[PDB]
C-alpha cells in the first residue's frame, strides 16, 4: 500500500485535468481572500444536491449554472414570480440568459426548500410537480415527478429532474409558464407543505449543468475483435458443459466473461478488467415431484470495465 497510494495521487491528478480537458493547471488563479458569496452559493447547491442523490459525455466535467427565482419589486410593472392557492403553488423562472447555451444543456434540477410546519394537519402528503402549458380543448399542465414529503419534519431540500421543461423554456420563450407544486390527490384537503421563498439562502432555484463544446472533441458485444478489456462469449449448455440433466429450462444461457489488459498512465491505483453489469438468471429444476422455479442473481456478464 506504500507504493499504491503514490500512484492514486498521480492517477487522480491526471483524472482531474482529463475530465476538465485542461492540458495543464490554471496559472492566473485569483486569491481566496475575496470570493463573491454568489459563487460560493453555486458550489453549495451543486454539493448539497449530490449529497442528496447519494441515496463519453459522462466522463468530462459539467459546468453548473444557478438560476435563482426572479426578484420581485412591487413598484415596477412586473408579474410576481409566485401565485398562491390552497392546493398548489406556482413559480416562474427567467431563463433567457441561457437561451444562447441551450445547445449544450445536459441536466436541470429544480431545488426548492421545504420548511417545517409543526402545526400541519396531515403529517404526510404526496406533492406533484407539473410544467404549466399554454392552451382550448387541450392540456394545461404536464406531469414531471412526484414526491412524498413530511409536512412536520425538519426542513429539507427537494430536487426534481426538469430537464425537458427547461429545454422547451429555452427554445420557446412563450411557453415559460413556470412550475406548479400541486397536491397529488386521487382524482378531480389543502397543501400542508410550506416552502421557503414561496410561502412567506433558501430561495427556489434551477441548477443547469452543461457540457462545453470544447470538451466535445474526443463494452457490450463491438466486442470486431480485441485483446484488451472486452467481453468474451461463453454459452453454458447444461448437459454438454456440466453433465447436468436436472435443469429442465433454460437448456443453456450466455454466461459470458470479461478479459483483457487495461492500460495505465481509465475512468477510475492499478486497473483490472472486471465485470460491470450483470443480469439475473431464471432456472426451472426439480427435486422429487416438487418443481422449483428460482431466480439466480449475478449470472450473466453483459459488460466489462477497468478498475
Amino acid at each position, epitope marked *: 500500500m506504500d507504493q499504491f497510494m503514490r500512484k492514486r495521487i498521480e492517477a487522480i491528478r491526471g483524472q482531474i485535468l482529463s475530465k476538465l480537458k485542461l492540458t495543464s493547471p490554471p496559472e492566473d488563479y485569483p486569491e481566496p481572500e475575496e470570493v463573491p458569496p454568489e459563487v460560493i452559493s453555486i458550489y453549495n447547491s451543486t454539493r448539497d444536491l449530490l449529497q442528496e442523490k447519494a441515496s463519453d459525455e459522462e466522463y468530462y466535467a459539467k459546468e453548473v449554472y444557478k438560476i435563482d427565482m426572479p426578484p420581485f419589486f*412591487p*413598484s415596477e410593472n412586473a408579474i410576481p414570480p*409566485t*401565485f*398562491y392557492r390552497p392546493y398548489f403553488r406556482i413559480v416562474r423562472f427567467d431563463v433567457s440568459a441561457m437561451e444562447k447555451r441551450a445547445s449544450n444543456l445536459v441536466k436541470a434540477e429544480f431545488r426548492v426548500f421545504r420548511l417545517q410546519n409543526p402545526k400541519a394537519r396531515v403529517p404526510e402528503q404526496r406533492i406533484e410537480l407539473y410544467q404549466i402549458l399554454k392552451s382550448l380543448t387541450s392540456p394545461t399542465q404536464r406531469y414531471i415527478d412526484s414526491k412524498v414529503v413530511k409536512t412536520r419534519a425538519e426542513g429539507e431540500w427537494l430536487s426534481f429532474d426538469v430537464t425537458d421543461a427547461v429545454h422547451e423554456w429555452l427554445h420557446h420563450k412563450d411557453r415559460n409558464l413556470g412550475f406548479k407544486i400541486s397536491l397529488h390527490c386521487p382524482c378531480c384537503e389543502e397543501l400542508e407543505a410550506r416552502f421557503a421563498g414561496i410561502d412567506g439562502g433558501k430561495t427556489p432555484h434551477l441548477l443547469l449543468m452543461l457540457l462545453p463544446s470544447y470538451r466535445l472533441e474526443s463494452l457490450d458485444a463491438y466486442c470486431n475483435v480485441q485483446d484488451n478489456c472486452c467481453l468474451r462469449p461463453l454459452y453454458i449448455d447444461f448437459k454438454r458443459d456440466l453433465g447436468w440433466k436436472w435443469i429442465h429450462e433454460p437448456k443453456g444461457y450466455n454466461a459470458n466473461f470479461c478479459a483483457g489488459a487495461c492500460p495505465y498512465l481509465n475512468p477510475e491505483a492499478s486497473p483490472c478488467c472486471v465485470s460491470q453489469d450483470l443480469e439475473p438468471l431464471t432456472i426451472l429444476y426439480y427435486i422429487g415431484k416438487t418443481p422449483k422455479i428460482e431466480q439466480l442473481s449475478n449470472m450473466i456478464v453483459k459488460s466489462c470495465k477497468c478498475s
Partner: nanobody
Amino acid sequence: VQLQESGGGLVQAGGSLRLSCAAGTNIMGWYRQAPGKERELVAGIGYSSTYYADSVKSRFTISRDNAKNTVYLQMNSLKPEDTAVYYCAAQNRDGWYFYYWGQGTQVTVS
C-alpha cells in the same frame, strides 16, 4: 381593452369596502399609491391563483367574475395605512408585463 373601477371612498378604521374593476377582450391585479409614496402591487390574480402583498396578508381578497369579466377586491378590516388611489391592471396578451391600467378610485381610512 378598457378598465373601469368603482367602489372607493371613506371608511372608518377597521371597516370594509369592496372595490371593482370592469373589463374589451388572463392575469389581472391591483396597484395602490399612497400620498408621497410610490406604487405597490397589493394583490394579483391569475393562473384563480392569487398573489397578495405582505402588508395586506390576511385582510384583502382578490377575485374575478369570468362571466362579467370583472375583478373584485374585498378590503376588510381597513387600517389608516390603506389610504391611497387604487389602480387595477391587466396583463398584456402574451408578455409578462401589465401595460393596461385605469383611472382607479380613491380610498380613505379614518
